[PDB]
Amino acid sequence: EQLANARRDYEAEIARARQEAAKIVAQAQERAKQQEAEIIAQARREAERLKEEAR
């Protein structure tokens, strides 16, 4: 029974772990992309402030 349930649980856990890891990686990538977009917007604001200083 442990052999049978171990094969079944290995398949189910591999599928569930792949799905959960993909979802967590997607969420972390979305958070990192939002942070990078905020950093790029801050850099653009600094460039605009430098342009205002040049003016």
């Binding site: 442990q2 052999l3 049978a4 171990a6 094969r7 290995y10």
Partner: protein, 51 residues
């Protein structure tokens, strides 16, 4: 009780009982061998599944 006919009849009965016991123990040895083989196969399958 000293006669050859009684000894022959008792020997025949003993031979019949010996044959019956031989069949009975031939069944249990095969049953035990099958049980041991099934246990070994189950353990091997469990180890393979874990790996």
């Amino acid at each position: 009780g000293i006669n050859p006919t009684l000894f022959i009849a008792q020997l025949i009965n003993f031979l019949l009982l010996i044959f019956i016991l031989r069949a009975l123990l031939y069944r249990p040895v095969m049953n035990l061998l099958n049980e041991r083989t099934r246990r070994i196969e189950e353990s091997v399958r469990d180890a393979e599944k874990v790996r």
